[PDB]
Amino acid sequence: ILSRLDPPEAEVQIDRLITGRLQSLQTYVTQQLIRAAEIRASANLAATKMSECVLGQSKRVDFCGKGYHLMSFPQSAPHGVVFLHVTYVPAQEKNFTTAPAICHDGKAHFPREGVFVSNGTHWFVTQRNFYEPQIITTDNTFVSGN
C-alpha cells in the first residue's frame, strides 16, 4: 500500500485490504475478553480456598482435600499457587455385637457420649472413632423413662 500504483484505480483497492484487516483484531479482542472472564472466576475460587483452608480449620466435607482435614501449607509458582493438605484416615477395623440401651433396676440408661459394645462376656462404652473399653458407670450415663 506504499509505493507502487496509481490513485484513481488503487483507492478502490486499498479499501478492501484495510477493511479485511480489522475483523482479525475484533475476533482477537473478543477471545481475550472471554478468557479473562473465566480466569477471574478461577482466581476467586482460589482465594476462597486459601481463606477457608489456611487461616483456620474447615468442617465442609471434601473441601480442603480428601478425608479429615488437619492443616495446610501454601507454595508459590509462576502464574499459579500450590497447596499442601494434611489428612487423617483410619485403617484397621473389627466388630462385635451391640445394643441400644441398658435396663437396670427397672430404669433405662443411655450413654452420655459413645456407644455400648459387648465382647461376648462383658459390656463397655467406647467413643466412635477409636477403640478403648471403659467400665460402664453412672458418671457417663443419664437416666430417663422406664
Partner: peptide
C-alpha cells in the same frame, strides 16, 4: 452389628490453580 476402627494413618495431597 457395628464396626469400629483401631489404627490410623496420615496422608498428604497436592493441588494446583492458575492465577
Amino acid at each position: 452389628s457395628i464396626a469400629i476402627p483401631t489404627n490410623f494413618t496420615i496422608s498428604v495431597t497436592t493441588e494446583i490453580l492458575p492465577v
